[model samples]
Target: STGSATTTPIDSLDDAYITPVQIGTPAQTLNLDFDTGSSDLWVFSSETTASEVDGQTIYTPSKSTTAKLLSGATWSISYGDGSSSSGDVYTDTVSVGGLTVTGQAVESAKKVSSSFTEDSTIDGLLGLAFSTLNTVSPTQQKTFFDNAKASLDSPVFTADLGYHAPGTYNFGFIDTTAYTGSITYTAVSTKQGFWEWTSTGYAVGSGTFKSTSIDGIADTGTTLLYLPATVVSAYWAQVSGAKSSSSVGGYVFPCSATLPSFTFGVGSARIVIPGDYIDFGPISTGSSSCFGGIQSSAGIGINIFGDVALKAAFVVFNGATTPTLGFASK
Candidate 1:
């Protein structure tokens, strides 16, 4: 009825968080990125071109007696970041934490982008977002979360991401010890198949809370926090030498600059992201300019409260028909 798993940051940049997943009958384990931003469980497989395969562990469907191809099925997906993967589909026994799904759709990547090939940390992605976002062609498939929800005590999952440390993902019920005080509940709109919500406002450091609504998605797959241009400009203005750098992408500041914390409102509850978290490491190995974790989502269309913001709070992704999200201080 319930499942639990541990996720760890893939690198010092906190680029992504990965959890171990068991696939096939003999159970070939792979470290997968648990993404709430997209819906489609896929992996690097034996089908992937050898040249495209770097250091990832590929899933071999032919080796698993229980694996079966989904006739005439194919899938392809491209992310906002421009990276992509595509392949045929297979149904196999997939397990996450301790929860098992007998006929889970496992998309095998016959092709992957250079970005994914270079990133040896993740074998693939396990999507936790709504199943509507699935990229499977002909007939769509339900996500692992969707299939498991019926057996779970509560159709929900929680994310407890940490700062360069190991975090936890719990399915079915919330862990009381994960957070402090109370959880502030907010209504969620799954219209676009994302956990989209509106923030009451935001504040720069200890400054006044700007009473402007910010619509954003809670994307665990994304590495940084992206807000409105004006909002991001206001925060960067506080740092003396911070400037927007087109070459490096987003705002960059002097490595030695004293950065200010960022805060956003969840109803009346305000979540404060530490100042240190804003300084997203140096642009280059020995460069004096460091990238800012908070950037403008001007061209991206939707604001994203990624790991930079989520790591500062305990997040609940409630999967009820009328879904809701819960945020609390930790």
Candidate 2:
């Protein structure tokens, strides 16, 4: 059977997209961030301390007649930015869209850091990365996509992330109705259990497209687009007042300043990010100081094409064959 899921934008915080998912027998619905960067389907639950729970919708295992606790099974997770969560485990039927995944291992959050506690809107995360990256102890668990692939008409899914706009994650079937123009395909390396790819080169808007291959991972959980230090410097140099701010963090500029477009190559295709898209937001509310969405990856080995970059195109995360990626304008 073929299925798809509509993912909604999170108000002003275009940091991530969230979708509705059902867990357990009676189906406790939760809004979760479908992350392609990490693996482990976890959620805030009854076990979470009241102070850490915040505004999240907690999943009650006891309420679900079909919920079965996996004795001794537990999971601990840490994000690249230092966010972390740890929890107990259980087996239950988790549903995405209208598709059902049986015997899915669900991580119940017992402890969470301030990073997670503050973003209470995000109840938990749904990992789309390879199952091997799963953090479950004793026995790692598979992702919802992995468990449901065998039953899908096509072992594929598409990400249409938008900036303060609605997007969709279509599973098992491609929605030709969503994207405009022809889809450009590229080879992907799953070596790191991520949808990793190498960009042939990049350019600034109408500038010459220089050839400097850069390896990067497509990460949905991350908020900004990251590139090499040299490349980031080149781009920021073109902006009048753009400069690095240690206290404010990352590069920031005046909100009213006009910015130049940036481009990154995928195979032979040139994917461009409009200048305005790089203006993350005012440093604080109506403040003129704005933070940049494209920053340097710094010490991180690989650059990251986070939501800021992913939203520019309708992305295809192919699980078939050696695994591949396709992109097109939305």
Candidate 3:
């Protein structure tokens, strides 16, 4: 069966896109963040402490006749941003857009870190990464996409992210109309359990694109763009008041300053992040400080082309032979 899902940015301020998903019998519907960086489909649930859940919707597997707990199995995961979630596992029916899979592994959170507890609107996360990365204990589980792939018309999915607008994540089919220009493809190395690829080079603004190779992942769950400390510093050095403020977290600049465009070279194709996109929304309310969405994170061991960079281009995650990734400007 072939199907696709359209997701929209929850808010331009946070740069998080969400899709409507259903789980269990009678279909407990929830809005979930579709993350390509990880490979677990988890939900806020009755298993979590009631007080810690905030206003997030909770999925009650007990209400669904099809829900089955996986004996002695559990899962724990932490992101680069330090947010973590841990919970038990259940097998249930899961659906997204028009696609559905029965007996899919559903990780139900019994505990969530502060970051997830504070994010009230997101009911859960739907990971689209490879099944090899799933974190269930006792035995690893396959992701929703992994279970649904063989039945798809084609083993592919497309991410079309928009700025302050609606975008789509299509499965089994690519809408040629969603993007402009030619789609340039590159090989992805999945040893890291991510859509990891190397960039030919990048340049700040209209500067000549460098040829330095930087390896990174296309992470839809991540909100910022990360590069080497030296590379990050070099880009901000051109801005008059840009500085790494400990209190502000990451790099910050005067709100009124215009930013230079950032471009990444992939093979012969160039994906560009507009200048204004770098000027991420204001750092603090009633303040003139604006945080740059592009920053240096030395601890992560590699770079990340997060939502800020992804939204500028149409991306294809192909799970066919060689596991390739494609990029095109819209």
Candidate 4:
């Protein structure tokens, strides 16, 4: 029951995802991309040195009298995008929504570069994705969730990523009202990074693909849906007027035309991807455009559904009993 309401096991990156937390007094909440892929909640600080950190929101500890910095602890994170941040660790009284957790561990980066500083949309990132991957815990520092769980209303915590809404990351007691019934539970595997999974197959348009099965991990850290090369080609082939367009870095098709629906099946559950997800941005060039949910990554070891695909479903990570991943209708 990996897709059920139960707390699913989390052993790797595929099973790891996080929700944003509000920090500071009279708490100002930031919709953060919580990550277990790496530890370190590097919010763009007012002290950041980079120029690109313009649009991104920065958290000012000085503004909040409740914020506290940990002495002698220094940190840095380098992303796949080649953007990096370095800073010192701090202990602060952080609050999420109405839930308040005092002495919460947080990172206050003093030297953030362009990649983080410029993005004004994001105030900071929360690292509740998992505990093992946390940078704060060298030996025995408490995790963000570990500290907050005791105060949470339920043993289960759910993350709802509002893909259509920018800067919207929701967390709290798992609201069963949003779902149909009980959630299926999966056991966690002892892995180093984020949880990983192998997709049995995918459905494109009205056609189901069994022969084109692929293996990929579901990542909450990523922003888009990424598919294997063969899968992407086969999926686009099913679209009536769809054609590959390199301009947007994916397939292009007429938005006005009726496009077949697409979904991917995990075990007995079927997760659907909406057409709007495909019809991304404004039309350009000679072709009408849509964001291709499936992208070709030649020989990439893992395929990620990312937030775009994940937003359509109710995902649950159960670490209470054992490590497991579950998915269901939203």
Lowest lDDT 10-residue stretch of candidate 4:
1-10
Candidate 4 lDDT for residue 244? 73
* Positional deviation of residue 187's Cα in model 4 after best superposition, in angstroms: 4.6
- Computed on alpha carbons, the lDDT of every model, listed in order, comes to 0.95, 0.88, 0.88, 0.58
Model 2 lDDT tens row, 1-330:
666677887768687788999999788999999999999999999999888988999999999988999999999999888899998999999988888889999999999999888986788999998888999999888998899889988898889887778888888888888888878888888888888988888897689999988999889888899999899988888888989998887899878788888898877787888887888888888889899988989967779999888988889888986788888887
lDDT of 3 by residue, 100-202 (tens): 9998999999999988888887898999888888999879999888888898888998888877787888888888998898999998999989999988888
Task: Give the least accurate 10-residue stretch of model 1, judged by summed lDDT.
Answer: 275-284
What shift in Å separates residue 267 of candidate 1 from its native position after superposition?
0.6
List the candidate numbers ranked by TM-score, top first.
1, 2, 3, 4
Alpha carbon lDDT of residue 58, candidate 4?
61
lDDT of 2: 0.88
**Off by more than 4 A, model 2:** none
Q: Candidate 4, residue 36: CA error in Å? A: 5.9
Q: How many residue pairs clash in each candidate?
A: 0, 0, 0, 37
Please report how far candidate 4 places residue 148 from its true position, in Å: 2.0
Task: Please give, for residues 218-241, the per-residue lDDT of candidate 4 as tens digits.
Answer: 566665567877667776776677
Model 1: colliding residue pairs: none
Among all candidates shown, the one with the greatest lDDT: 1
Which residue runs does candidate 4 get wrong by more than 4 Å? 1-20, 26-31, 35-38, 50-52, 136-143, 163-172, 187-190, 209-215, 240-248, 252-258, 283-289
* Candidate 1 residue-wise lDDT, 31-148, digit = tens: 9999999999999999998999999999999999999999999999999999999999999999888988899999999999999999999999999899999999999999999999
The TM-score measured for candidate 4 stands at: 0.78
